[PDB]
Design a binder for this molecule. Sequence first.
Ligand SMILES: Nc1ncnc2c1ncn2[C@@H]1O[C@H](COP(=O)(O)OP(=O)(O)NP(=O)(O)O)[C@@H](O)[C@H]1O
Ligand SMILES: Nc1ncnc2c1ncn2[C@@H]1O[C@H](COP(=O)(O)OP(=O)(O)NP(=O)(O)O)[C@@H](O)[C@H]1O
Ligand SMILES: [Mg+2]
Ligand SMILES: [Mg+2]
Lengths: 296, 292
Amino acid sequence: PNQALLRILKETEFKKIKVLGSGAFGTVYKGLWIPEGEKVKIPVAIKELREATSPKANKEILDEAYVMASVDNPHVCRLLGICLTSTVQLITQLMPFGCLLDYVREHKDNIGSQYLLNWCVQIAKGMNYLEDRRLVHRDLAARNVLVKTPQHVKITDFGLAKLLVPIKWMALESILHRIYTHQSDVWSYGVTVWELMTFGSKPYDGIPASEISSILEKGERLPQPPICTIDVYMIMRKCWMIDADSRPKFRELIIEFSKMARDPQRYLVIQGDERMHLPSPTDSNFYRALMDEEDM
Amino acid sequence: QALLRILKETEFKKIKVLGSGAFGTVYKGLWIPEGEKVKIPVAIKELREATSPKANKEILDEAYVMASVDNPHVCRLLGICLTSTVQLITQLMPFGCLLDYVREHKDNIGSQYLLNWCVQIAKGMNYLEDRRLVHRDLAARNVLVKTPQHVKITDFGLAKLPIKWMALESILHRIYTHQSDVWSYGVTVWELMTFGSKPYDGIPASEISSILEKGERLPQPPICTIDVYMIMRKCWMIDADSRPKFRELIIEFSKMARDPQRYLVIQGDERMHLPSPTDSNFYRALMDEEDM
Ligand SMILES: Nc1ncnc2c1ncn2[C@@H]1O[C@H](COP(=O)(O)OP(=O)(O)NP(=O)(O)O)[C@@H](O)[C@H]1O
Ligand SMILES: Nc1ncnc2c1ncn2[C@@H]1O[C@H](COP(=O)(O)OP(=O)(O)NP(=O)(O)O)[C@@H](O)[C@H]1O
Ligand SMILES: [Mg+2]
Ligand SMILES: [Mg+2]
């Protein structure tokens, strides 16, 4: 792993200036990195991990980080820099749009089927890249897709679970036997797609994680999203098959959700979809040049 | 046409006043995507002379061209807003322009850095020559820094819509060709090698065209060997067809950047900053995702 792809930061190089949110693994501040000997202050995203439980040695952390920093894909967020102190602080590119989950919740009325189906494509491509790299995310969820632009999404918090439980997003084998494979990540992908098709609903609402394994071991799955058709749900329902090797491979999902994007009026049904905002070329280039710029 | 976004004056909102010049004024702007909760830092250019609907037609037409300059080393016109007066939207560069940068880093700036900016500025200018475009307003002030290791040329085609940088023929006959930009390039390079000095300082603009014909040229920058100043001087030939072409200055500078100590003599060059691989990937990943 290119040991130059991860830059070691001294705590004096950057500043916390805001709290964007917290999760099971740490707190994420919006940050500013002042290049040594420069008057500019560049927007970053510091995530401070919480040690528990229980802690890795400084060297082993580096090794895992050198791997998270070696992630090169248009749809997978890469670890830019790290900071070892009394705590460990990860540094990534600041995403102003926030996570995808929050995005749809904000826009439950404005999304077109073209958008949704495309995000499933981008997430799948991203997960596929990770799969091809023999890397297991472990923690895939719609909260963990950041929106770079409304038409470009990426995946964060990769391999954090390896350093340091999202029960309602885990496949059965992960819950019961701590098994984590590219196929368990597929199940999580299914839940994520569910989250998207329901404009930010909560998986198993009211049902305590305590016994999610129970309902699952009894064949209980999530409601067929209101806007989905059978073609689509057949796929989701396939991602949640107790037999792991029965679930779709990511490369196949790319093709599946791609084929569906060819005519999104067919696989998805939405209020103003007949006339809802499709990404215009002249609009997309503006977004890309000003905010994106990365090869994809 | 997809390159130029006609912005509604609502979408964007000026904020800080970054500066003013010959062609207009610059503000730190904010593009607020119509349906989004995001505020995104841009760079706004309010042309200093107002404009009417007919001049607008001619303006957009150039604006499409400016929107099409797709080069890592030349700034692209992202969006435009026709109103009482025309407004242009480009990327905002926190590092500011290359001129103010050299002056506030005289002692920090080493061989490798200077000789590289030159190469880049040549690449950008060569791109404009390859596309038969005439910059007209080249100067260290027009060359923006994206990262201390990646510079870009701005205010292209703004002239079509400065004496001390202009070529002789530009001053005496308002002629602007690629070789006349090669002249402005020479002065630009000079600006840098002198860590920001003013060209022909103490000599009134109206009397600049004069001294040129008597054979007066900017002095050899204190840090320049003859391999370099020979090139700067060749850019200032009276015969336009005699000065270097941009495709050549790229080569000749690339030659020197592969052995910086020799062609540029700077005190404390031995300790001077080397752009480490990691520190670079950090800048690129964070700021310039255009593979610098
Ligand atoms: N690069 C980023 N840019 C902008 N916001 C970010 C970025 N990374 C994380 N966030 C925000 O950080 C907030 C919460 O931090 P986080 O640690 O990701 O919790 P989480 O991912 O929702 N829960 P978890 O599954 O345990 O990681 C999320 O809502 C994200 O929107
Ligand atoms: N994209 C940008 N990002 C940051 N600053 C910018 C950007 N574009 C222009 N500026 C600033 O705008 C300020 C004023 O420049 P301007 O009004 O274009 O005239 P100028 O730089 O003197 N060139 P000129 O046209 O010959 O007057 C400069 O100091 C730049 O630093
Ligand atoms: Mg997250
Ligand atoms: Mg300028």
